Design an enzyme around this catalytic site. Structure first.
Site, short mmCIF file in Angstrom:
data_model
loop_
_atom_site.label_atom_id
_atom_site.label_comp_id
_atom_site.label_asym_id
_atom_site.label_seq_id
_atom_site.Cartn_x
_atom_site.Cartn_y
_atom_site.Cartn_z
N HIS D 98 -1.49 -1.04 98.26
CA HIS D 98 -0.04 -1.16 98.13
C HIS D 98 0.16 -2.67 98.23
CE1 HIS D 98 -0.51 2.77 100.21
NE2 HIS D 98 0.57 3.14 99.53
N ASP D 101 0.00 -4.19 101.62
CA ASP D 101 -1.30 -4.14 102.29
C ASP D 101 -2.01 -5.48 102.17
OD1 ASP D 101 -0.92 -1.39 102.78
OD2 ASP D 101 -2.04 -0.82 100.98
#
Ligand SMILES: [Mn+2]
Ligand SMILES: [Mn+2]
Ligand SMILES: [Mn+2]
Ligand SMILES: [Mn+2]
Ligand SMILES: [Mn+2]
Ligand SMILES: [Mn+2]
Ligand SMILES: [Mn+2]
Ligand SMILES: [Mn+2]
Lengths: 437, 437, 437, 437
Positions: D98, D101
């Protein structure tokens, strides 16, 4: 006679394309100091196997069985002949039954007793020539309309009396046929709604009932193991012996604990939200693992499915608990399982039992290796060793108090723990599963 | 200062369009011989209300609170000021807290103790001028990384020592602030996997831990009620005090039963597969209904949601159990509830509590009528009367055995039972609910 | 004749101590522009009410009914007489049935048809003198052993043919008695195990089956509403029309969507892990809320319990959905409910229906107020207004793209949201519930 | 540098006592015409593996990682270095992430973009020297407080704009790093309560959002596979893409079906009450099995546990579905799994992945044999053959109607079916499992 197609089932080994043979269960193969047969003590449930019809809450009975042409006592007798033929062909050491499974109920109690005695006579002189023995029998206190509000927990004292009579006769039959155990299952011993329930009275009466039973057992000199089979619910919204632990609480409250052990059924454990192993473990550490009903449910379905045990993780994990308990002792692995409604042919009774037996044979084999190689024990022993020395040992010997513990905690820096190693342990389990060859 | 918009919340009655007022909870309205305030003994959970941030397994903290600008001890102090302001405006008799809720943990135990004492000093001299009192406090033995494998059930004896110290300090604070109860919640006292678990040791140690506590409580002269709060799971895959019944089994095994009572939380009961009422009933008939955490979960969601109690059937049904227990006694209705992540505004803390308080006020009002009108009792009394006379009375007096019961059953014709009247009882419940006007 | 004790049930109002009277359901009371009777369109399920026996997976039939003395066609006829007597005394506008509910199945299809026609003749000339009409009928494609592997999803093409015949006759009877709807329930249309299942074929055939039905319906000129009743499972491990949404997916795939609407049953929705309201909402926003089976399950029990609707939150919340849909239209509130096994007396059929009817009357009354006072609508309208103006309106008109949206997002500071006001909304709901007086 | 203890992990075979080696996964072993590496297309989840902290709803972060000393961008960079080291040592072909992240979010969107670009630059010139490639990336539209009421389903049009920007940037990064797929997960795209929800609007907007995405994808020339990852609930009480089937219904309604395929995660399927295989099967027969998140949940726990796949029945059964789909094609087996909180050591990241990889290697091996030996196919083919000839073939060709089918059914005697052979099939599965040697 009944199963003509089927010849006596034999152990043929892993590489065998024969559907009607044991691939892993070899009755006389030694696993440690006992043979597979001595370890597993397999038993067949009379109810599902000989009286089950494949009916369904939305379906009529669909099972195809040779003895279906008969009615009444002819049917009862036919089933006994069939039963023993099945036992022989499958090579089962034990069986179990409810009173209503073996003989038709009468219009009056005296009648019921007559029909029962007749069938018991027949069963007795059959055991005479068979290796199969009665593991345990029990009284069905849930099927009849009379038990609608419970049996011993019924609000109708006449029903309490009736249930007592059927349990009295039950114990006599047990004594007579030499049952190793006697099982109690409180199917209607719970509630449908708290709104009309005097729970303390019901529980008080359940205890009075069980007390009378252990008393009668002494009077007639039974000496078999009393067993209680827990279940969370179904038929009841809540069944009193919900859990191994819940039932334990009950027995402790009324001082019935020394007379009982538990009969644990997989599907029941999962229905209570526990794993099969968990229930066995709890029973086991309390010295109350009496016997097992070896089935399997679906965890996505919230009712009893009573499937035959095919999941090898379960069988392995269950057997690990059983071996650590020192074996089943007086109990056994009773297949309280039932063929799927789709498996309605006679031969499916055999396929089903072979599946369950092989699955438990495999489970026994690997659970045993796990134990002898100390796979899990090695680790558990290592991670709990703080309680072996220093402060830990004081805690255990009972020479520690809040003062010393606080004094200790005060001089402590950052505490260091080590991994629980779950993924590793799980990986190991797989490796042992796959090393069955 | 903190809640400027909000003025002290008052009881305004049913027909009142004011969102910030009690529609049903009137502190001094008499219901029987006690006022609503005396009956309900409301309490606010420090944790959710003053330290909660609306974070979510997939979301960051989103709650909007006035004291958010502060850090460290300034934040701890700010919260205390805020706490007491909230108590006053809402008119709450009690509150509860974990040690970590009120003061920031230190880098060493000695530090933690310092920060705690400071905040406790502040709390003490505030109680001095407030009607609010400490219902119960507790030690948080689950949030810190050190408790990863449990606290008293930890495989690391240093962690056992540390937990003991925090419980020791916990009891001292309880004694000091005059807590009526002291709560134990075994958040990490269970297992994540049986594979690495020595269950008998863990349970043995949990018992040793609790024994040391009741001993210290005597030594310092605490005299408040010890409480255990069961829960089936979460964080643990299985928490040892799964049930009221399961915990009971434990206490009985180790002879800790006379020192403890239970703190029952709705969401926990439903998570174990029981109804809130059920857990209260069981506790109650064992004289172990100590106190209540009044929340509500979603039965379609398998985790704790800690919602405020708005379901009136639950509140009514719970209150019925509480009234029959003779009231909460020393415990109270602690709102271990939390605003929905979507209700992130400060005023929602008030809306939420009003909702829960009114819902319990209604429940108290109707549960009481049900009891005084003997709505359910009338019927229960009638349907169990077989145990009042003849054979039934013999069963109860303990003058019956399998012989007499069988003799009786033998002369019995068709047994007749009567309806459980469930739909009727349910209909009645509705009628009483709707007669609140 | 059949119900002699029971006299015609009348509306007596809230303050009425009479168990056999409507406390809230007043057939001709106006709620808005329609009377309660026109709004609620109550219907009784022939199956549960006249052929149900209270049997249980562990219990024999225990229900006490006057027509039990009869067998075969005498029983079928007796039930019809009884049925219409019950309809009259309870004042029900509609009823529903499966073909097997009204007449006994024959040994051959030709026989089955004969028995059916006889009973249909009798029903027709009874409707002649009764206010009660057929809401919908249906073909039972699950109870017979022949449907063991499904009906239209069966692997046996003969079973597909047989099912088609029974649905063909079903539609003819519908046309003849002027049913407003025709219901399909895929009880065996799913799987027990994927291991032996050709899912794409089964689904293909299910679609072919339904196509043939809508074709036959046109040919004979039926013109009633086709309905599909979803369910997640039971008897099947997985039933294909699991959900309103899942069934929708199916209908869309095969272009059957314009011919069908859904029959939503509460217990089925909860079993799929949805709330009753949720299923109604989804159906509703797709213009596919065809009719309702008004029952209630237990959320702690993972099987269909088919209880009568007493929970007022549910009835209110369901009615809110129904009113917003513009009413039930052609469908109705069919009580696919069943008395508890403990409520085995004849009078319980009445108590049960009164309970369900009053509960829905209350739900209608309050759901209507919620709607006319715009209690929830007021708020929803306010919190979504960003889509009314500026960028929001562009999004809706379809004049926005990632470019403009990004450009917009770039000039944005901290975004501010407002509370979802859940506790408030829930509190409000309670206030309206309690304002029923 | 980061993992110094750990040397590159190698395939060592079944009989190998080395904890840090593959026992079954041999990257270049051929299984059919493709090697294990080509078949399995393993991928690691950046989030769990490099940013996960072992925090728990009741526990603080406890994970021990080498890069923990760093903050901000130093931490982001450190993780990238670590990430690629881990990829190399474990020999993984792919990874996923993501946006949040890989880089820290800024105070404004422009900032967020800067930090992202920096980290993307670093990732790009690392892929340059690594075998590891980006399987898919995605936009995190659930963690930030701004998405409290949803993203595309938010009632705040500014949030819709913001979500669109983050997805726009998401697609650009995908195009830039050559992602094979782009995943959408509607974490907040559902509801917490229907009471304040305009469902039709939310769904309309979700569709408008997805349309804008597929349009932008064309504009920039992405050409990677769009994926939707269903989930029933958590965080939401109800998530809109509940099911593969439910999401399908949605896509069909709005004509987005041709642009999407599904990303199926095991734990999500079980949470919806389906088996992992079931979800794969459904996706598969609709040609919409896009990719897999290979984890495993606990069926006794009603929340996502994200465990690593060790259950061999699941892996086998999943792989069977994947092989029949013709393989994963463009997707892969992304380990959206997470170490147990008890496995907090760095080496557990390796143990965990080895466990999951070996388990899928075994599953691939046996699933393949099942398929080539036509174990299940042989039977399925035989039991459905009625649709090959006579009336059955007419049904399929579409030359049958209710008339012919009824005519046929009329001349039919007793219909005969054959066993579903479930226990047999299950037994067979075990035999193949155990024949892995
Ligand atoms: Mn069972
Ligand atoms: Mn059993
Ligand atoms: Mn809680
Ligand atoms: Mn609590
Ligand atoms: Mn139903
Ligand atoms: Mn129905
Ligand atoms: Mn997940
Ligand atoms: Mn995922």
């Amino acid at each position: 006679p009944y199963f003509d197609n089927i010849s006596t089932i034999a152990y043929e080994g892993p590489a065998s394309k024969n559907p009607l043979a044991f691939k892993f269960y070899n009755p006389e193969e030694k696993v440690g100091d006992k043979t597979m047969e001595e370890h597993l003590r397999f038993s067949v449930a009379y109810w599902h196997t000989f009286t089950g019809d494949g009916s369904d809450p939305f379906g009529a009975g669909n099972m195809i069985r040779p003895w279906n042409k008969y009615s009444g006592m002819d049917l009862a007798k036919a089933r006994v002949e069939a039963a023993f033929e099945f036992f022989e062909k499958l090579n089962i050491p034990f069986f179990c039954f409810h009173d209503v499974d073996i003989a038709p109920e009468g219009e009056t109690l005296k009648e019921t007793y007559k029909n029962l005695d007749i069938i018991v006579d027949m069963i007795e002189e059959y055991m005479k020539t068979s290796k199969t023995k009665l593991l345990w029998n029990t009284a069905n206190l849930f099927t009849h309309p009379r038990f609608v509000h419970g049996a011993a927990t019924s609000c109708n004292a006449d029903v309490f009396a009736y249930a007592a009579a059927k349990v009295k006769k039950g114990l006599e039959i047990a004594k007579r046929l030499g049952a190793e155990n006697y099982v109690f299952w409180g199917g209607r011993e719970g509630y449908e709604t708290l709104l009309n329930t005097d729970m303390k009275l019901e529980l008080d009466n359940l205890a009075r009932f069980l007390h009378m039973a252990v008393d009668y057992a002494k009077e007639i000199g039974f000496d078999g193991q009393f067993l209680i089979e827990p279940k969370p619910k179904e038929p009841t919204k809540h069944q009193y012996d919900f859990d191994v632990a819940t039932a334990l609480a009950f027995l402790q409250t009324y001082g019935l604990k020394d007379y009982f052990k538990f009969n644990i059924e997989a599907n029941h454990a999962t229905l209570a939200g526990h794993t099969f192993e968990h229930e066995l473990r709890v029973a086991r550490i309390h010295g109350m693992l009496g016997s097992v009903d070896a089935n399997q449910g679906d965890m996505l379905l919230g009712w009893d499915t009573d499937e035959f045990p095919t999941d090898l993780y379960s069988t392995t994990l269950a057997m690990y608990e059983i071996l650590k308990n020192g074996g089943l002792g007086r109990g056994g692995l009773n297949f309280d399982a039932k063929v799927r409604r789709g498996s309605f042919e006679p031969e499916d009774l055999f396929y089903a039992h072979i599946a369950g037996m092989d699955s438990f044979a495999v489970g026994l084999k690997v659970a045993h290796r796990l134990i002898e190689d100390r796979v899990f024990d090695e680790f558990i022993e290592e991670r709990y060793k703080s309680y072996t020395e220093g402060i830990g040992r004081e805690i255990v010997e009972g020479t520690a108090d809040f003062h010393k513990l606080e004094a200790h905690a005060l001089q402590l820096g950052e505490i260091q723990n080590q991994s629980g190693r779950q993924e590793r342990l799980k990986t190991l389990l797989n490796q042992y599963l796959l090393e069955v060859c």
